[PDB]
């Protein structure tokens, strides 16, 4: 079952500058020491990326239904794995198929299925006093599932889902697109030690999956997690707290890019064509 969440505090939407972020490999061919040019759906450099984060301090729980405007760049800064999946679909109300990607602390599961979703889907981390152990106790994403076409379950794994206080230690970058019935996902998993906003740097994303879902996608949502413990008073709707974690969402657009490959085959630098005249001249020359 699912419970609507009550303890909230709205704020104006946070915005951030995404600079030299959102670049992925175009193909699966080993090119080294070559400056290659290409055109695709890319995140423009120095774009204005929307920012949501969950902090207790208020309680600031935010995970709305965002448009999937022909591609999405999702980047999360976390230290305790509060962000635990995504939902994609058009209506998300059992009239159309929907895609669900979830890390439930044992297996990462991908399902294309006519889900009947809840208004505020989530998962419950719980903390106990018999032992100082966090674990996942609740799964409140969808009420029902039927006519359930695609399905993948990974191997079992054990992951530290404990609440860690301090700097955000992990950046996880993801690019999602839906091309010709194929849901393409690109990933990049890098440690950091920054707390405020997007790191000042540059990392080229790798191709992960190539899922054959054949789904029309226009809207999507993030699946966050709740700590619940004796410290949190109230029922399931209010007796909870949200750990400190953040994510940023930027919309892909059709652009031309210049990419440079080092001698080992990896990307080192890129130029967003048609950003500024200097970049335009780099692009032409």
């Amino acid at each position: 079952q699912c419970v609507n969440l009550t303890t909230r505090t709205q704020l104006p939407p946070a915005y951030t500058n995404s600079f030299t972020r959102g670049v992925y490999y175009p193909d699966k061919v080993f090119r080294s020491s070559v400056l290659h040019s290409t055109q695709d759906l890319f995140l423009p450099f120095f774009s204005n990326v929307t920012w949501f984060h969950a902090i207790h301090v208020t309680k600031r729980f935010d995970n709305p239904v965002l448009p999937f405007n022909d591609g999405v760049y999702f980047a999360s800064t976390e230290k305790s794995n509060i962000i635990r999946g995504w939902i994609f679909g058009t209506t998300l109300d059992s009239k159309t198929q929907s895609l669900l990607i979830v890390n439930n602390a044992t297996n990462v599961v991908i399902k294309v299925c006519e889900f009947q979703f809840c208004n505020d889907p989530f998962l419950g981390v719980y903390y106990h006093k018999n032992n100082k152990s966090w674990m996942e106790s609740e799964f409140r994403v969808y009420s029902s599932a039927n006519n359930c076409t695609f399905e993948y379950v990974s191997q079992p794994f054990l992951m530290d889902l404990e609440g860690k206080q301090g700097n955000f230690k992990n950046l996880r970058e993801f690019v999602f697109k839906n091309i010709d019935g194929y849901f393409k996902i690109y990933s990049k998993h890098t440690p950091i030690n920054l707390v405020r906003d997007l790191p000042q740097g540059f990392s080229a994303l790798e191709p992960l999956v190539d899922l054959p879902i054949g789904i029309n996608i226009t809207r999507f949502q993030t699946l966050l997690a709740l700590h619940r413990s004796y410290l949190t008073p109230g029922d399931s709707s209010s007796g909870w707290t949200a750990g400190a974690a953040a994510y940023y969402v930027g919309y892909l657009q059709p652009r031309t890019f210049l990419l440079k490959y080092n001698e080992n085959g990896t990307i080192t630098d890129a130029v967003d064509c048609a950003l500024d005249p200097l970049s335009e001249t780099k692009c032409t020359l």
Partner: protein, 49 residues
């Protein structure tokens, strides 16, 4: 064996669409029921031997 007879727009390549909502052919929405000027989109092949 059934085929989708009505749709608001054409499919993208390698796209599936297994929704069964009533297709509003007319300009008056018929709020989830069949009748006149809105049809059930899936029609069944009749394969006599």
């Amino acid at each position: 064996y059934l085929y989708r007879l009505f749709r608001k727009s054409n499919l993208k390549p390698f796209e599936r669409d297994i929704s069964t909502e009533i297709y509003q052919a007319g300009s008056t929405p018929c709020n989830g029921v069949e009748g006149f000027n809105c049809y059930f989109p899936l029609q069944s092949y009749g394969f006599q031997p």
